[PDB]
Write a protein that binds this ligand. Structure first.
Ligand SMILES: NC[C@H]1O[C@H](O[C@H]2[C@H](O[C@@H]3O[C@H](CO)[C@@H](O)[C@H](N)[C@H]3O)[C@@H](O)[C@H](N)C[C@@H]2N)[C@H](N)[C@@H](O)[C@@H]1O
Ligand SMILES: [Mg+2]
Ligand SMILES: [Mg+2]
Ligand SMILES: [Mg+2]
Ligand SMILES: [Mg+2]
Ligand SMILES: [Mg+2]
Ligand SMILES: [Mg+2]
Ligand SMILES: [Mg+2]
Ligand SMILES: [Mg+2]
Ligand SMILES: [Mg+2]
Ligand SMILES: [Mg+2]
Ligand SMILES: [Mg+2]
Ligand SMILES: [Mg+2]
Ligand SMILES: [Mg+2]
Ligand SMILES: [Mg+2]
Ligand SMILES: [Mg+2]
Ligand SMILES: [Mg+2]
Ligand SMILES: [Mg+2]
Ligand SMILES: [Mg+2]
Ligand SMILES: [Mg+2]
Ligand SMILES: [Mg+2]
Ligand SMILES: [Mg+2]
Ligand SMILES: [Mg+2]
Ligand SMILES: [Mg+2]
Ligand SMILES: [Mg+2]
Ligand SMILES: [Mg+2]
Ligand SMILES: [Mg+2]
Ligand SMILES: [Mg+2]
Ligand SMILES: [Mg+2]
Ligand SMILES: [Mg+2]
Ligand SMILES: [Mg+2]
Ligand SMILES: [Mg+2]
Ligand SMILES: [Mg+2]
Ligand SMILES: [Mg+2]
Lengths: 209, 34, 169, 294, 159
RNA sequence: GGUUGCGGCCAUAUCUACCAGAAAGCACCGUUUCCCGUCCGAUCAACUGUAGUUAAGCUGGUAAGAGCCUGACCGAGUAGUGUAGUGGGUGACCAUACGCGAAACUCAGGUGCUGCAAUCU
RNA sequence: GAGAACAGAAAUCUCCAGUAGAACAAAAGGGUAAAAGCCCCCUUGAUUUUGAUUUUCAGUGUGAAUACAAACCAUGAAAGU
RNA sequence: AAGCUCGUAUCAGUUUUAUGAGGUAAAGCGAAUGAUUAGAGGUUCCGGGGUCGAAAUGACCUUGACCUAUUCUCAAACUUUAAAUAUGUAAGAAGUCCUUGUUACUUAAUUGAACGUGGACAUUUGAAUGAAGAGCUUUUAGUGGGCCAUUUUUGGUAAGC
């Protein structure tokens, strides 16, 4: 089967996810959403590039997987399995249906999944060191051909996967306001109890600098 | 003569509680030997 | 800061969990009557388990609640049976504690082979003056953090009087 | 404390009414007491509020308003030394006495006291006070138990009997009065009369003085010091009913100092709380010792 | 098959507000209602008796009767090309006094008293509100405020 | 101003932790002849106010506390939207015109108010 | 969660927390915490007479429901229901 | 179609002001329900297997489960918040105020609830706009295959469906 992806490209329906009402739906053809060095510290990978969608449309879970593999391959082979963090930013929670007598009672059984994408919504994200910009770009650029419609590749002022365009992050980094979590970080709060705030960020206070 | 204690629960079904099942026992458990 | 608040027993509840209905139950019930001097209370099986042989609502067991000096005397008889040695578990993190013996004849209670031999669960709950703050209908309230029987507190009270031993730990 | 209530839990917690939290007020009972038939419009439902502290008896006649409850008149057991009871302020006869004082005091200030005499006899027989023909109907008042148990022979119904024998209309039944026998299905007025004058307390003085002089010395120590005899109990209450019905009017306390003087003292033991600026100091200061070594 | 019940589709309509549940406070039982009053019907889902049918939710009308626990209310319901008069029996938890009349009454007092202080001084009345009039001539100054001139902004990505 | 009975609004009143509380009140507390209720005078009942204590309840204060309340040109005139064009775009969809205009976020402030009666160095 | 002979994942007994995460015959939705849930006591308002009203609506029938009036009962200490 | 009653009388597919109802759009998920990616810390005497130690109730080893604090992504039959457009009611003479009559209802009560007598206030007669008139009755034709456009929108890959 697998009727062409021309048929489901546009968002014509209210979101129809797997639910207590709708069961017997197939598995997503994309499972792994994080690849590369996924446990690398926030400081490892300053440079962040995004694959951003310029249209309003539905992406198939089959094409997510195809383009996910597509990027990851060119990234590992060129720059090495640990040089990047690729995170798919979009999940296929929408169920397509096929009719598969007459038009009589034509409601569909679930045909597959797709991820609802918006104008400017982020689809793929990668973080590396600045030295690797060219390679990540070509990774995403290679993966755009697996997607329907138009998507743009945007160099993001921001530190890594966090937030806080790199100058602003650097100010908190040599502050002591940055505690390394797993794969992510936590930020010193001026709100919570002064007691466990000082134990949580001993470097800021104290000594305070 | 015959006193019986009142049971405050609302559950009227004759069914095992959620905690009952053969899983979570042990190997050992008491390991009586001789 | 230690005036009233001494410590004491709220109640001692003797529990013989029989496991069936009929002669054996009303028999072991007689033991607690003839021991507590009160009339005992029977519990019903919450649900049927076939492996235990019990059907829901069938009367499994009997217990009885004792308060005041009379409890303090029945507890003493129990601690003799264990030779004034309990274990560090044995003790609720809320301050309560208990133990168990086999063959009830081991404190008073001659024999009566027609009545029979039964063990029982000893559980005793500790509180302080003011425990009716949480038990009263009007203005029900919660005992403060100070007060509030703890496991460290009543283990020490169990060694201080009775001249007995904690164990393990 | 390992129970550790989450921020989400606190947020979705709905608070009960304040008076429900402190556990004073039953709002399922209060809805049914206060609610007025709406074709009767503004006519108030008058409650007989009876409460028992450990040392005292509260009796209040209460109506309700959106802005607040409003009390018509009040009578406490601690007023009873004025009418001759210096002891047993929490006992049954005290309630009957306090119920009679609030019965008499209110309808006095209502101009209904002369009409609707009440009983004045006190054999302990069950009757409501029924309306005069060609005259005003009795002041109707409904018993407010509060959170008290309904038990046969509870002190609160001593207040009820006092107020109904006082001339107020407080509808009721016998079975929660002492002397009601389930098997007999009737009220023995003897025992009830006994409780009105404290027969249950007096017989205890006699059996205790005879059986235990020491224990008797402890409980009734006030009676030995006051030269009050055991069987004289009936005359203390009988005569209190005289002076009460004679002078129901409330006299307030003699009030040493003034409301102003009390206030300038009674709480200046209040801890005054900090300004926001003083708080920024406490924060920046609390920094120092932990900033401190670290 | 199709389902239209008496409470059909009231799921959210008769839900009780976030964190205001359980017992009904006593003020609603202490309000007092007079024939000719104007009332706001909002059903209370915790009180199932004396309940308005979902149509009248939000509707406001006049009370034509007063009973023990309830008021009769008159509502004009359009059916077809005309309105029909409906009489509703509602328990006092589903009812509230309209605050709209309350502004009007207060303005008639204010109007009566304005006309008195005017007639006592023998001067002009003008008790009918005028709508907002366009505006009046102003001189705004430059002392302290020098016009700070603004420019459109270049496109920038923030992602 | 404290405290109590009955309340109104029902977290600015709750939650956690730790302190503090003069006087009255409230409580804990002593007792089991009586009514009354229990497996158990723990609860409920009754008696004394005597033998004891603020230990708890209660009340207040503390916390870069959790929650809750409030305010803002904080975000944002953003998102969403009523109206118009023989506007753009293969389409997806987007920009413009006359109007309406959020939520999250961020910051800042606050932590019961009050009605009737009584009572208090 | 932490505790008590036999006793085990699961018998029965405490204590502590617990905004309802339970239960309310049944479908789902609403509603409910000194209860509308659990247990107990007493009951027959599932009764009498005929009107008015809401929903569907033609403002016909029917089913169902709401508030009174006039009786006779229930229950509770009572207001009430 | 026929009229009938009256006539600035009241009327209105509109605005303004005041005051209600609503749970869609959007928003939310380090807020409940339900789904979903990833690492980190902590607990397990209250799980599977440890390659040392016969001991196994022992340190140490992996992988579960749970707890806490975080992170990516969702909802017609989710939700705290919450529009726009739509929608209910009101803007007086059938009103307002004073005085004090009636009653078998209702109140402890000459209290209230109704419905009145007599007295006072008409300039702008209590928003805007319009109004070419308003109100009312009888009687009877034809129709009860519809279709199209914008926007909202369901089934369908779609359709001149
Ligand atoms: N998430 C993107 C959104 O962008 C538009 O909103 C624009 C908006 O569109 C209008 O939407 C209204 C809806 O009826 C109407 O006014 C007009 N149809 C239209 O011009 C524009 O008038 C604004 N100038 C810009 C705004 N981004 C769309 N309206 C939305 O639907 C769309 O999903
Ligand atoms: Mg569709
Ligand atoms: Mg492409
Ligand atoms: Mg049960
Ligand atoms: Mg938990
Ligand atoms: Mg939190
Ligand atoms: Mg009650
Ligand atoms: Mg009766
Ligand atoms: Mg349907
Ligand atoms: Mg609502
Ligand atoms: Mg609302
Ligand atoms: Mg019903
Ligand atoms: Mg006794
Ligand atoms: Mg006692
Ligand atoms: Mg008692
Ligand atoms: Mg203290
Ligand atoms: Mg705070
Ligand atoms: Mg258009
Ligand atoms: Mg605009
Ligand atoms: Mg507070
Ligand atoms: Mg266990
Ligand atoms: Mg508890
Ligand atoms: Mg009940
Ligand atoms: Mg009915
Ligand atoms: Mg949405
Ligand atoms: Mg939101
Ligand atoms: Mg979050
Ligand atoms: Mg781990
Ligand atoms: Mg291990
Ligand atoms: Mg808001
Ligand atoms: Mg808000
Ligand atoms: Mg026809
Ligand atoms: Mg035809
Ligand atoms: Mg055509």
């Amino acid at each position: 089967a697998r009727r062409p992806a021309r048929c489901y490209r546009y968002q014509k329906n209210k979101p129809y996810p797997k639910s207590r009402y709708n069961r017997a739906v197939p598995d997503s053809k994309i499972r792994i959403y994080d690849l590369g060095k996924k446990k690398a510290t926030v400081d490892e990978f300053p440079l962040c590039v995004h694959l951003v969608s310029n249209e309003l449309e539905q992406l198939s879970s089959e094409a997510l997987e195809a383009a996910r593999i597509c990027a990851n391959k060119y990234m590992t082979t060129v720059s090495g399995r640990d040089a990047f963090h690729l995170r798919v930013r979009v999940h296929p929670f929408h169920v397509l249906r096929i009719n598969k007598q007459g038009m009589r009672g034509a409601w569909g059984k679930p045909h597959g999944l797709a991820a609802r994408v918006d104008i400017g919504q982020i689809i793929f994200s990668v973080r590396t060191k600045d030295s690797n910009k060219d390679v990540v770009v070509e990774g995403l650029r290679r993966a755009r051909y697996k997607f329907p419609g138009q998507q743009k590749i945007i160099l993001s002022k921001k530190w890594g996967f966090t937030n806080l365009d790199r100058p602003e992050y650097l100010k908190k980094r040599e502050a002591g306001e940055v505690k390394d979590d797993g794969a992510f970080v936590k930020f010193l709060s001026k709100k919570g109890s002064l007691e466990n705030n000082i134990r949580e960020f001993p470097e800021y206070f104290a000594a305070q600098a | 003569k015959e006193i019986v204690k009142s049971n405050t629960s609302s559950k009227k079904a004759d069914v095992p509680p959620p905690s009952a099942d053969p899983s979570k026992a042990r190997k050992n458990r008491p390991r009586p030997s001789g | 800061q230690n005036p009233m608040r001494d410590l004491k027993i709220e109640k001692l509840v003797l529990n013989i969990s029989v496991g069936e209905s009929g002669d054996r139950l009303t028999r072991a019930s007689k033991v607690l009557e003839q021991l507590s001097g009160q009339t005992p209370v029977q519990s019903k099986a919450r649900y049927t388990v076939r492996t235990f042989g019990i059907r829901r609502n069938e009367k499994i067991a009997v217990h009885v609640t004792v308060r005041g000096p009379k409890a303090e005397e029945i507890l003493e008889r129990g601690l003799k049976v264990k030779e004034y040695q309990l274990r560090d578990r044995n003790f609720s993190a809320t301050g309560n504690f208990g133990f168990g013996i086999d063959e009830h004849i081991d404190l008073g209670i001659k024999y009566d082979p027609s009545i029979g031999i039964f063990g029982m669960d000893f559980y005793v709950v500790m509180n302080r003056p003011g425990a009716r703050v949480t038990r009263r209908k009007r203005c029900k309230g919660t005992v403060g953090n100070s007060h509030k029987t703890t496991k460290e507190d009543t283990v020490s009270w169990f060694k201080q009087k009775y001249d007995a031993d904690v164990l393990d730990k | 404390q390992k129970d550790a209530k989450s921020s989400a839990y606190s947020s979705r917690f709905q608070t009960p009414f304040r008076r429900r939290r402190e556990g004073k007020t039953d709002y399922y009972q209060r809805k049914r007491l206060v609610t007025q038939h709406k074709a009767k419009y503004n006519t108030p439902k008058y409650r007989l509020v009876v409460r028992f502290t450990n040392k005292d008896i509260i009796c209040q006649i209460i109506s309700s308003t959106i802005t607040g409850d409003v009390v018509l008149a009040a009578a406490y057991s601690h007023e009873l030394p004025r009418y001759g009871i210096t002891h047993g302020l929490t006992n049954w006869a005290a309630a009957y006495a306090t119920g009679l004082l609030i019965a008499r005091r209110t309808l006095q200030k209502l101009g209904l006291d002369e009409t609707y005499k009440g009983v004045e006899e006190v054999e302990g027989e069950y009757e409501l006070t029924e309306a005069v023909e060609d005259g005003p109907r009795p002041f109707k008042v409904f018993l407010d138990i509060g959170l008290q148990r309904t038990t046969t022979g509870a002190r609160v119904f001593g207040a009820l009997k006092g107020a109904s024998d006082g001339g107020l209309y407080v509808p009721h039944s016998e079975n929660r009065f002492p002397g009601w026998d389930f098997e007999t299905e009737e009220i023995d007025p003897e025992l009830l009369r006994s409780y009105i004058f404290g027969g249950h307390v007096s017989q205890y003085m006699e059996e205790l003085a005879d059986d235990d002089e020491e224990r008797f010395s402890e409980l009734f120590k006030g009676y030995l010091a006051d030269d009050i005899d055991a069987d004289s109990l009936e005359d203390i209450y009988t005569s209190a009913h005289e002076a009460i019905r004679a002078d129901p009017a409330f006299k307030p306390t003699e009030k040493k100092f003034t409301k102003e003087q009390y206030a300038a003292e009674s709480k200046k033991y209040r801890q005054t709380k900090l300004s926001k600026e003083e708080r920024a100091a406490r924060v920046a200061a609390k920094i120092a010792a932990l900033a401190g070594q670290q | 098959g199709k389902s239209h019940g008496y409470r059909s589709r009231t799921r959210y309509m008769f839900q009780r507000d976030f964190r205001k549940h359980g017992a009904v406070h006593l003020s609603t039982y202490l309000k007092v209602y007079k024939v000719g009053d104007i009332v706001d019907i909002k059903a209370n889902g915790s009180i199932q008796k004396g309940m308005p049918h979902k149509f009248y939710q939000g509707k406001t009308g006049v009370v034509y009767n007063v009973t023990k626990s309830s008021v009769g209310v008159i509502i004009n319901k359009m059916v077809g090309n005309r309105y029909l008069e409906k009489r509703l029996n509602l328990r006092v938890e589903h009812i509230k006094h309209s605050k709209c009349r309350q502004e009007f009454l207060e303005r008639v007092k204010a109007n009566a008293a304005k006309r008195a202080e005017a007639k006592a001084q023998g001067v002009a009345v003008q008790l009918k509100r005028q709508p907002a009039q366009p505006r009046e001539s102003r001189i705004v100054s430059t002392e302290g405020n020098v016009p700070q001139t603004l420019a459109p902004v270049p496109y920038e990505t923030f992602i």
